[model samples]
Target: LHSEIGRLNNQSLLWGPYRPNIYFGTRPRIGKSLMTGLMWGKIESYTDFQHTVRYTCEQNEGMKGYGWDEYDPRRGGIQSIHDIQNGLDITTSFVKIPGGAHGGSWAARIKGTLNDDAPKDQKTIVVFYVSQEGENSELEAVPSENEFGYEGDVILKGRSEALGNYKLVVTKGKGVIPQSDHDLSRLRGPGQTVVQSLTYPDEVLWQAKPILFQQLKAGIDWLVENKYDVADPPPPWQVYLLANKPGSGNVHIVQKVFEGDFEFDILFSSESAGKEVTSKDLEREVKQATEVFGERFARVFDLKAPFQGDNYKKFGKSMFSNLIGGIGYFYGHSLVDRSYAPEYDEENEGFWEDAAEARARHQEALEGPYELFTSIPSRPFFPRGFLWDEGFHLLPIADWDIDLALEIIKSWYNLMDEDGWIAREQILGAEARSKVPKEFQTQYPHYANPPTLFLVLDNFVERLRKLDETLSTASVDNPEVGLEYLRRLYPLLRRQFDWFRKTQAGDIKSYDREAYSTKEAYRWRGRTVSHCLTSGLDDYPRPQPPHPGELHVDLMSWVGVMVKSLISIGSLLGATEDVEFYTKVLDAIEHNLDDLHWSEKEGCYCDATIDEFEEHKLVCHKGYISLFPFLTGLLKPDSPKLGKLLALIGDESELWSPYGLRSLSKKDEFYGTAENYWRSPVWININYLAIVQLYNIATQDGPYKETARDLYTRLRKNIVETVYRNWEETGFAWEQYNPETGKGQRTQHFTGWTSLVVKIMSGHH
Candidate 1:
């Protein structure tokens, strides 16, 4: 099941041009396996035993020669192997392999009386019984006569002739046991020297007769009960058995039967500890999984249609499908000898020395590029985690599976080093590294991805509050649970907060502007005038010729949100001192947001730059960045700043769009520029956050209430409808959508944050 997605062919089946090896090991390999992670058929032998195993289904078809005749199957054409069905099973998988016309066919059936759940002292058995449709099929063992024989559920060499050196022992459940009196005379008969005997199967084999019959009955029962495929083709009737060395460390046997248009893989491993798994077991697993998932599903989208004639049902299903599809893309692990060195010289011609010094300081503050894992944004495209993406990624997942969400959150936090640096992009391990381009592979210490983890933590606390007291500490009846969760996370979060304040803090001392005096104001590090890509909104219009001393509204606003999260978490954990501490920090951020970054003439918070003379000027480009203060819930509903932000949001000529909020202001100098990425396109993740911010205060009765409700309704409808229509037309979701046409643009099948549209439609935000 291990696969690699080839870049040349992104589709699952064709994408994996190479498959990793599978192997088994014996004892004294404690904490290790003898031949683990090796190709199935490649190895010739293991220790003293000779082995032969075939994996790819052998086939014969009329194929090609070359040139113009290549169009025609001229009898000597290239052979075709089926990789199509293999890729289809990458997510929600079920792969099928067709049978061949050749002899020595392989087929597998259900396990019945096999005692898979045996005790540690008891020997474990693996059965690999296969049968062919035609009688002409050959035996895989020694070349001889039609010499198949059976003896009391145990198929031995008929028990009539002396046992040969090797026996084709095929049995159902009563496992294969080697005969002792036969092999000494025949081994030296061939062109062989000394030989090791496999006569003693007692140590390796186990007896269980009803396993196959039980599998047959289960498949029949399923077909009969479902009445869906009632005997279209009869269920498999045969099974096989294999023995393991008495104290072998672990064994994984994968027996794939390729005798028909369908293939069934019978998998057995010492890991199973002899717990038999049948068709019914599969059904039970599926049923239980569905039931548990459905509860979370129901909770999220349980409400009736928000508006009449709305396709909430369709919306809910699509969102759930995308969410489920997103889960399929989850991949993470650690990296070796990886480190980050920022590309910082592009901004200032001769600033490398200073930048290097700063980098060294930050690097020393950082820790190992060690055990890192997180859910990715997309499959077939963005197959690795982006720091900013996970925050939004976890929003719905937290609602669906809190424990699973917490594991991811904790994993992300675990990646943070001493200086509280977690790379903006997680390109871990060689496999994950392959998906990324060469230039972007190395991480930077000074770069900061948005504090999306704060958003996830915020959602986590709320969900914790809603859970039953006995189930969660955050519940009112069990405030200790809430306290404990925060207590565990407080130090990690504090490190991150301190990291941001320390690394991204702007050099306001150099600015001549009276408004810029405090260190609370911050700007993203490692950015050029051409791009402040680290903000996760690459190519968005910003002050040209980047200035280290400049302040960023969005960056400051994000810090505000993080501070607020700490404040809330502190209150929950009863850290009265920390709550009051961050409260003042938040107050300072608010003051700076208005005094330093706010553009009086432009009517939005903008970035600032300090020239060589230490003169300061605001860089105003209205777009999604302006909404951060509101989106982060920093501006209260009653605040005049919120009112001003709403006016811009309501304005159709600027931030507002028919589909949703535009990434860049329609009236901005760089609107719809470059690759059109984060320019004027609409991103659902941000829109979802907008709706969340609006809904939080829309509950209160005030002038802002009606405005919040209107914005929420329009944004939610537009976001969902845009994705739905584009998905219907394009047959895929997108990385980003064109605000003008509501057409899904960029990479298709991008479930990423676009899946967050579900939270909006569910009315959970």
Candidate 2:
């Protein structure tokens, strides 16, 4: 699902507009506080659940306001914590003054309570916390009785401060912590400790401390020293940039079913006599339909409107309810929206059964007086991953219209590069600007999205075969149509092969030929996590790249996927030499797995390799993709090595997850959330591939047909329904579902590559 946010161009990191992190910090924090850092580097252009307004009024100074009572709900006052917690009475008690960077000061004081008895839940505490945006990195308090002064800068501002509408941060009274962990002693004074508590001494919660507002002056000095904006600066727009998620700048989605060029039956609201329709008329009808739906469902489609306004609340409830019902039924689990609470298990009976039942109920709701996308809430719920998953997902779509499936895949293939590469994601708005390059701006990441391209193509072929078992008269073979389809898709597959060949880097040709599982390009390495809050993939160490000699175990299996894609594409396009080349590549890729990646001592493939470092040095982390080569037929299924891979898959300590397969084995010390956003979990794509390959391997022999059939049939059944399972369990759908619980682990009801999962399942004939 692509966000409406602005996009960043494709680059070395991030392929699409998908927000990078979805992490939950280890400890306990209120209101998902961990999510704060994820949005750090971003500039919030859209309004959200929080009406919290932050902007700059003049120069490098700015302000942010949490609440305003005298103001109406539309003016950033409705979304405050006070509104959610206390309401009007609480909102009325505080007078706000915005004063940050301009003079580097901010002040807010308590006012009269509506009813005398409404205890001072809102106390006047001058806290200074240390943060990238806050004081020295610690948050501390200053004397409320006097006009406190200090030296820090302001990060947020509003339309106006005197009107008490905007918030401005200052350095004086603001107690902020410093980023330098070693320099705490400089701020141990003012007779108070900065953090978790106002009083000193129980235990130092160093992370909570804020840097003194004055500290901003020093940092500003350094930026000046480096020639960053300091004085009058560029336009107000470019002056103080907001810190945002590293990869948030990129993420995009290329639509499938909802392409502007679409066809739909239309009749006048009054049900006038029908008229003959032409192509021109069809376009007009689509336009009219869009306009009509847009107006009727204005609240759902309009992003600029107040987020928590009545419209949003009503829309959120309805959409969430429908999704809840859809997931509950679709996933073979119980659907629990606002009314159906899984937390109160006793209230619901046979949650799974009820959920399955609800799927139909909710789907029926989709056909409505409510209209299309305009009927659903926007923020957080906008479709994200539905685009990438469309291909395999199209298999299920065959039941609805094989022609639609054909058109979708063919059109998608046309979008692929001449080299045959497809990006992992496609986002809209600001996220579309992936770092890839100006020429590749239309796409997201330039890398091949895992290996599902082949599977989707295979599924399409199978569907066509089912449509017309006889090869005598199929349209696909028609030189004009079938040949065209092949031609369009051929380059895509070829590019995929090229990716496999060049995915890794090393001095030796053999090493160069191997595949790499991680997205890191040749010459880059990654930072291991310790207590980091951020997650999702990262490319740290700035200027370095990945080296080929590293024995990245996942690459071995990915090569198998490439081989399959290459073989299929070559056969389809009549690229004889290409087939032979891929066959040899496959053989070599398979050979290298046994010859180099395998560690007889460890009994598993090596984790990764480093350039210039010792060749094939194993990192020892057990990630699921590592087992791909064996599963994809590069290795004999009966081989001992296969047994080890299978054992690893079945072991709970390794890859096992109740809902599906985990990307990385939980047993590894390096496993778990590397960033709050990225974590060890079961991604549906990998699971889909694993199930399909496993079935293929089990059935390769004629005698094992039944075993293979069972596996294949079970996989088809499970994969289709898992979409609902994910949603029913967690009231959200995600790119990667939690391995243990079969629910969304991070952001609730996230969108992206996974939307296709349910669409495919729902399309299942």
Candidate 3:
């Protein structure tokens, strides 16, 4: 137990900007511990000044683009922001030094570049703070002469069981309080009296902007009452709009008032009764961190052909960096429905109608204040971990940092309930649920998203297996760690497979369906007529009325994929019998894919549903669902289904577009409908999977090998260019792209799965 725990608590990952929801936030992975974040807003006019302070990311907050330009979870990286609303370009870069017992020490270099359009006398108030989450933790604000226009070495220091002793040093910054309430012109030098720091509840710590204003007002009121020498127009530094103290409360903050472009450093040096790291070492560490980042980035990604240009390289860097930079640590209870409705089992006829009615009468319960360390979907829109999306998110990260990947994967598995079900979305407690809608807050027990994490598992096994003669990212240097991780993970993998098979199983006995494997069918639960939320392809057209008797081709393909993954895991662990058992489990599912889902008329796979006559019928959606078997590698090179899938994916009038394969075929009735989410958009995750499968077929000696290769080349280039073009224009990666014009649409900075473009650009072949 000690050995395994030590392997996870690597000194490298002890500290990180894990709080990715805000512009720049840092926290240790050790419990609910110390945290620090950056907040700044333009102070053009006093009326709108209070609201302009930007902390948490928002869609309508007028940010042009904000993401990391270079990043590695193991050490450190660089982040860039285009604060269009404030006419300032900001860069937040950091470097980590690995040592000591409690994580390590790191330095963050935050500098702002005022653009040409910025006002000559434009004033920006910046807030930097350190707050403790655990009750035992405390932050000490070091004694200083004055906060206004004062230069200092170490401003704050603190100690906790989780973090040992640490110091926060900064290059002094200018500050501004207020003019005066009693006499408008009777203002002191930006009110030299520092804002007194006070203790606040955790809720108030997150919402510091309002509280900070109150503190600022109090300081102004105190200064006005005291008779001080006045200046009609004070020094430029006297115009700060924020407030703070240390040890007095869980939160301590420092205010900096800046005129024109300015740069500062917030260096955190952690001492474990060893050599102390101070700001003296900050410059050298940042230089080395940046240089190594470029070298490793070139080696790991190694962009090929059309993407060899400099700008294209930058695009790939930003995409991959932002994906990793979005990793977040969330701690809170998830609200789940525990009303124990029998409708979930779908036993009686007209079960669909009863299911909805029963759901309406459900009582929601708080399951846990569970902790999850996972990458978020979008910092602004989806600053939360999504189930299926997480699978795709970890793929590139797995290749980049195997240890970091395993940590997240383990955290996810640990989140599984007694029944082996993990919530589709992780909305932890009130803070996480605040951004979510009331209808989406409660997770249904029976709903299951695709087990995409298995894809990451497969990638890990292959990458580690190839580690004998290969040099990988920072984490894969040690072969034993990866092997040990899988050894410990085997039981969880088997349990997850069984849980998926048990919950989503479809009953073929009642309908008397004929198939090779009678019990091998599956369906997606929590589906409505207009949507299949559990499918993770919301608004994609499905059989209307949401029949419980219907079996989904995608869900079955997902099952097939999971079975194959189990076999791989079993084989790697030297469990011969386990591998044999899972291989046969996969055989039955493969046989039924053709027997139950094969549609000879369209030469494609289709979902199976009961017709009005109570007979088995195939429903053809002609979209991602139809290609599941082929996409999941369920089809062979010589199969008729493979040829038709290739034809459909390449044809312009069907699923093919200049950008890439569209989610829904253009010829379909539901294509580009009012509910147009998944109908006609190009999703990067599915497209990337299709490319991988196509490459696999193309590499083999087969009759249609050249056809597969031709499609792979064009599709690969199309997707890379599509994502790059849009990112360059908008300074953001998007959730989905328009099939018509290859324009970005939906969740901006959806760098999770969208960053798979980096892998496709690398040429998997």
Candidate 4:
């Protein structure tokens, strides 16, 4: 676990195309590997710096032996690299000296890289440093002869420190391109290596106030100039730093650093100089960094509230940090065309008429290559864009920053093919593919993720109608910006609606003609043993092994909501024909939802599939899927159908739990079975959807309003407390929670849609 944590949280650091990459964390000590390439490469370092601990001539080879302790059992004498649990701040991560010994401390951060005046082919060298001394402590970086060893060809430079007779050196090297599957071992190869080391006298006492600041600025300036590129633009390097206790009143500081306009006179004195100097320019740099961080904290969590507790505020901030951290930019060819083969049942002998035509149309969409830039579900794990997950990820951001939300929505739509098919999972690029297993990598054109994008689109259109400069600066006085945006998105949504209908359309000829309004009913494709995983609710239990005539209630509700969104967007953009066209589809969807999918006896909407004898059978799994009619806005607040969904959600023996709403009803036979994923887990994403549904309904006066308000309060409190309590105790926001124990069950740090707690806490839902 310690090794894994080290690798995940600290193992390798990444750089941009023109930036240098470094590996400062590993088995032995700091300064392990330094790569001048865009990626990492093996370069070694040896330091002669020391504090309270005595410096001995006896040391292991290659500076990997710097901090080795013979008495300690743990490797290199360091504890788990998880220095801070669920780091509250995004920019800086700090670690405690191993075993809490204050004798000396160490920390490293991503300081800005050198780009100004740098060679176009002269690899961008990233500048970051590790301090091994604390405040008001005497330390030195000493010159050593035959005391340091380096791998590969190396070049070194020296700089003089003001206070002590010390020198600072910068090291850099050109690196090699890695293999397609950039494995850990490939980071090292036959390449030129560089080494630079600086030494200080033992007499220098590095004070907390000036010495630390001066040293930091000096190091940064030297790197920026030595390896700087003049063509690089401003908003200079954002710095991350860590400082240990310097005095009795001094406390550790870990945060990001920013600088304002300033020019510094960086003088590297000779080893014999014994004078001290201070620069107002350096002072301005620190001042700007301080002010910038203050502004940033306020900007990130711009939402204000009269919350009953501080937990909501902290969570809101964490959610914003997590969201930005998980955002990814990916590019590659999609496997949609090459991987979509028709599934055939041996007993059936041939494809159904609908399935056969769908297969050919899917083949028509076999276009190569696509690009997507979007937020992922999480970082460190699940770091790729999931089509369904992206919609939920954007919900809170829509309220926080509409322009950013719109940009992401636009990116997702950019991936849409001519047939309106977007792959459910976006595991693009060689790097992205490495993270996924081979079996799950390919995407099928026949499959569809839940139409959650419509939910965001619905809000976008509504917000645009009420657009004010206060809402977003992107809103314009001319009004064309908003109108054109809507115009562009409307047709794409219409195409998706058309695709869902043609592909997932169910065979319903056996149903009584008099009992229903529309001839067509909607079903979900890709219903294998894990029926409707594409619906984003895996293992809710439908008929095992898909049948051609299966119709899903949840699928119908999703399409109904999507059609309504398009209609709303059309009306906003003054497209009367589109509004009329979608209105008809929406009307038919409502009628079908009422006549075919609703099961009065079961008290919820259920799946209807035809048997071999052609009899319609309702396959009921009373859960979140059953509540889709209400959630997707298909069921009106005044509609009688609302009462049945309310009963199911309110019943303690069914959907309601002390913690939150369970994915599957507790009384069902499959409640907690089949890996217990969606079977009974209380996922915050769906519960948030249910809360929003209730909040929307509570705006009107009726019996449903009182019920909606009461249930909304209960669900809001339960969901928030469940996540808050677990985060407080475990320092993690999880993928899902055990509905009964309220314990987090799956992936940790999952802010995806779970961050919608921000909207819920703000009462904006």
Candidate 5:
């Protein structure tokens, strides 16, 4: 790398149509070999550098003449026929879906040669007007919009005025077109055109009887939605300034939360003096923006970077380091954190039963650990982390500060979308921050990530009790107030749980579909790239068939957590029916787990599908994911399976790792990309589950307590060292870490998962 010099810096200007469409190609239809749904999508605009009066301006034009035309026998071959006197029959089509406004859209791949050679900086005008039919009307006709702001039943066929054609020139290499709304003359340069961003109101959804989930759609087209009329220059998107306070105190309450300066750096750059600019200037600009915003920084970084972009090796180290750091914090805190109760005895009641007793017996276990969010400055960006991981992460932290645990739950509960559903990952996954991509949502079909609210609720009751116990015994009797508080929350929690089943499991049909569809869906539920059967679910090392263990672990984990919550509500409110309902769910879950989920041959519970490994006799490789059974109590410590699991961890040829347990078994033939988001690296929640279960089993004066303690300590130590090392060098916590290279990978620098790092490093020995 040459040292940065004056020219090098100038030459290093941000270049390219960044994140060029990387399509894996259209999914071929079954048996017919035809591509499904046209396999067509919007092309990112190309951009060029242009000099402004004082600075450079990036004026991107709309994509004109940007559609595909295919030869349809139904539409009379490929040739275009005029006015149809001696014409051919032709039909052009588009698509629409269940989402929002602008749902219907035209689609087709552009002719390769024409698209490839099209002038990048030239404008093309397309006049789409209804060609009034003649007495001997044409056989085929392309309909159009007559009035500019007319949305009068936009019929696909009719006689009407020719819609005026406007040039949508691609001025910059970036296909972004400059529009009248954002004139290049006013802006300083390419990066200066500020696109206003929109945010959701906190009570916008909750305040309404029926939530307002109307998605706020944004794009260049949003600026010129000819459907809307503007007597004057369209009022600056003033809707953002209006506050929807619902059943409110001060309108300022919602206004203050939703209001923010909407500024966006142009996605494209302008060509400078007819020369292409390529360098780290864009990187510096983006980094500067990120530094300025910190947590509030919410733009998706599209530019490829020298450090984190395309560097597989560096990426690997990052994952390993993250795993180690996460595990370290959890372990150190388990010993140093105050999770155990002085009043309960393991001799008379089961270890979990004692905690369960704390739920029913004392208020400390329920409320003490639940106090959260007493003091929090309004931060710019809401925290991001998977729902499932947060539950386990909370357990250890509950040992020291229950308030933080309470606040975490409240934070997530507050963020539920209008539909009462929370996404599996927030601001972490690529599509997490924006509208989900078509591929992720439907095209590249995958299951939703499992839920964790139940588990968090389970711990919440126990923690709340602990806190309440500290208040007053008399307060417990006036229990009408305390129980009523929990009662109020039950309906909300119930709604969320039911929503998970409906949205994810999809009524009875989802169950049957899951039962019959290929094993890949259930087994690799969230592992988009995984297809292997009979293994832990994830996105790497070839997918696996669904196993009973995978499903039951999640199901039981949720069930157990839910049961604890229900029991707390029942005890407090004297709700017999609620008590019975949860009892049934808890029993049903345990019964199914015992009879259907366990796989003796694999020595762990497996994800269940209608059909089993009856066909492929592949021996399942035990990984940290297999540890799920342990987490949910499906695999008792005394179960003979313990030996098999420990053996897998001990064997260098298997799941063992010097840093931490690998996500996939090291020796498994299918193991791959040891540091990706889905495979190989240890997740904090997984490690925490293992440690907690060990402590669960270790309650007996058996080898488990000591052995489990040692392993937990080792795991915890690794996480601390990794965090300290990464932060010492890089000044921040990361998403994941590699054990081998001791560097962070595929992770945001300031991550929610790493919040565990804070609790561990500060609260533990």
Candidate 6:
């Protein structure tokens, strides 16, 4: 039974709503596969049809809230959507059956509840479709035996080598299938062709609505050209959009007309080569799966009495569920410039001007967008993988499913170039590139993102070691799998660290700066006078008059974090020399952080810059930058800095807030200045580590033990309650919280790191 662990884990990830931006879509983990999805809307007027057709999640739709209520990536779950504009509450219930060839069989039961706001006799069109993304796939409609025009059970048989054989079975809907309701063709068949075997690229098929609209628009334009029943008044453009004339091939579309309330099931069951799985079978499977999920959630999280209540349980579940549910598999090329790869570091005085000119002149043709299988930060706002954010994302995910987190982490590692650089923000392919502005699209070879994922790797190693008893329950059940993964991934982590140290290394010799760790001291490259986009905290005020002789405390702390994690991983894999090497490096970094980055003037760690006199001075912004040493767990419990950190975090006029610790202190002159990012608002990712570090010190014997304990309890409570209350009010988790209002703001449905509150709630730090 244990021998099957590898294959079983591989099979588990084969299916999900991997195309997360869409309203309801199911696809396997393959790059290009058969895509199946649901699209529906109220079709009384063209504007209604145009505005109401819900295929993908969009902020412009002004949806109340839409996300998974209970979800697991390996096994499917239910997605709850509130289409306030269309006055519909929709739920997509999905279930996965494991034991089958070609990954597995999956089923979805889509139900729509029409609210009182919708017309009592509302005419709605529900469309279920499948478009072949890659070649060598075929689908055929199986007509109903009970009634004409597929009035009863609508079945479709499909086959592909990647998927083997499968049945797309649609049980009857809760509304009448109009035989001839169109004022256009007035012709309905067992199947209606939405788009014929139209030759379109995979990119077109990826974002379905645009191509769907284009084809329908072409059909409407054709009618206009031919003067064929050219009455724009009677039958709407949606008639042409959904189509009436039956055609067959590449894309298969089956539509049904309904009035009032509606519910339907579309069962996608794979063949043995197979019993056709009945609708009732899926209904029972999902029902049982739901109960199993609830039980597992309680066991995994073990929420306290107040949080264990049903409402809070559901709320917590939704937060975790949507974070995983929003996982996306994206593939394409990127914009990159590796022209100055060898010694890209500009040592001259006016480095930023040259850096800007270098990108403008040497930006390469689009690089391999490549393939990345990862969870997105927000489906509507940020539908692509971001490097540093993934580390925070995997924190909650690793607890729920260790194998899933490891796989995603592995995928991210796979994206590294030969120089071990992974682009900070991955806006890959045409669809993703289209969403980003032109100015911020290029990826430079020298740019570096914080190596935050190493923190999760350390957490994984701890789990395997059973250091954290609670984590062991959610860890890889098979120890062999964990060890084998580390064995392979060990070199990549080392290579990445080597490149990071080399590229971001500060100019100690050129500036003649004194530090304990000359080799380890670093700065964030890709910095301009006003911003350091490479820092992941864009427009968080850096020192002006960009210099070649500057060092950032946050970057130094990140390297410290990377080294600490590597040491843990190295020890785990029995790389004694590597472990010892990193151990000394960590010691050097800790000492250098004190010697170089420490700010005696402000009593906080800060970025350092040189003046005209060539003497080192502190740029103590007193923000997120000020707290890195403590945040990264490099500061000792009894260290003098810990006292100031506690003081800085507790004082409301400084960094403290009723919601959580603000990004910048109120006392800073630049507080809430410039772009105001990473300045005044409270960001949960940093707060997460702050809370965990506080707990670490609180549980240990330290000078500020009492202070640390009190701070931990209140900080955790404040962050959790604020995120929870705001989530309740806004119907979505936000990117950041307003320090003054404690209100959710920016990028709604940002279930990425914000979901770390789940861990804080369970006292799992």
Q: Mind giving the per-residue lDDT tens digits that candidate 5 earns over 722-761? A: 6656765764445556756767665433333454543333
Model 4 accuracy (lDDT, Cα)? 0.53
- Writing each residue's lDDT as its tens digit, candidate 1 over 1-765 gives 001111111121110101111011101101111111111111111211112222212211211100000000000001112222121110111111111111111111222121223221211112343211111212122121222222212211111111111112222222222222222213212111110112212212111123232433453455456442423422121111121111111122212222112212222121112232333333444344345444545655564355223355555555544544333212224332233444342234334455656545533332243444345555555556678888887777666545445646767787787788787877654445555675466576667889988988887777666611112111223446445656777889989999999878876665565653366778787665567778988888777666566678889988988898998788877789888989889888888888888777888888887766768888888888877888888886788778888989889999888998999888888898777798899998888888888887778877789888888778878887898788666545678888888788787546578877766776846
TM-score for each candidate, following the candidate numbering: 0.66, 0.44, 0.93, 0.65, 0.44, 0.93
Relative to the true structure, candidate 3 has a C-alpha RMSD (angstroms) of 3.3
* Candidate 6 lDDT over residue span 517-603, tens digit each: 667778888888788878888877677677878888889899888888888888878999899899999999988998888887788
lDDT of each: 0.51, 0.34, 0.78, 0.53, 0.33, 0.78
The residue ranges of model 5 lying beyond 4 angstroms of the native Cα positions read 1-386, 389-411, 414-421, 425-448, 467-482, 498-537, 540-552, 610-619, 633-637, 673-676, 761-765
Runs in model 1 lying further than 4 Å from the true structure? 1-260, 263-274, 307-311, 324-369, 465-478
Clashing pairs in 3: 174-257, 176-239, 176-240, 195-244, 197-244, 197-245, 332-369, 333-368, 333-369
Clashing residue pairs for model 6: 332-369, 333-369
lDDT of 6 at 245: 31
Model 4, 465-543: lDDT tens digits are 6621233325322256656766777788888888888777776664432345555487777655554578888778886
Where in model 2 is the C-alpha error above 4 Å?
Answer: 1-451, 464-480, 503-548, 610-613, 631-633, 676-679, 698-726, 729-731, 740-742, 750-765
Per-residue accuracy of model 3 over 1-765 as CA lDDT, tens digit each: 426444445555667888788889788775467778888777765345566778877866577788888887666778888887888899888777777777778888788888888996677777776677776767777665654323454366777888878777765633333343334234333343243456887754655566677776665556556542254423323434333343356777677666677777887778773566655577787787778878877877899998889998999899999999899888778899977588887755567787889878858888787988999889988799899999999988876766678789989999887787898999875667778898879888788999999988888878777721122343345667667778888888788788878888887888969888777989887776688899999998887656768889899999888888888777777889888878877898888988888888987888878888888888888998899998877788988778988888888889989998899998899999976999999999999989999899899999779999999899999999999999889888999999888899988989889999988887763
Model 6 TM-score is 0.93
Task: Please identify which of the two predictions, 4 or 5, would achieve the higher TM-score against the true structure.
Answer: 4
lDDT (0-100) at residue 306 of candidate 1? 53
lDDT value, candidate 2, whole model: 0.34
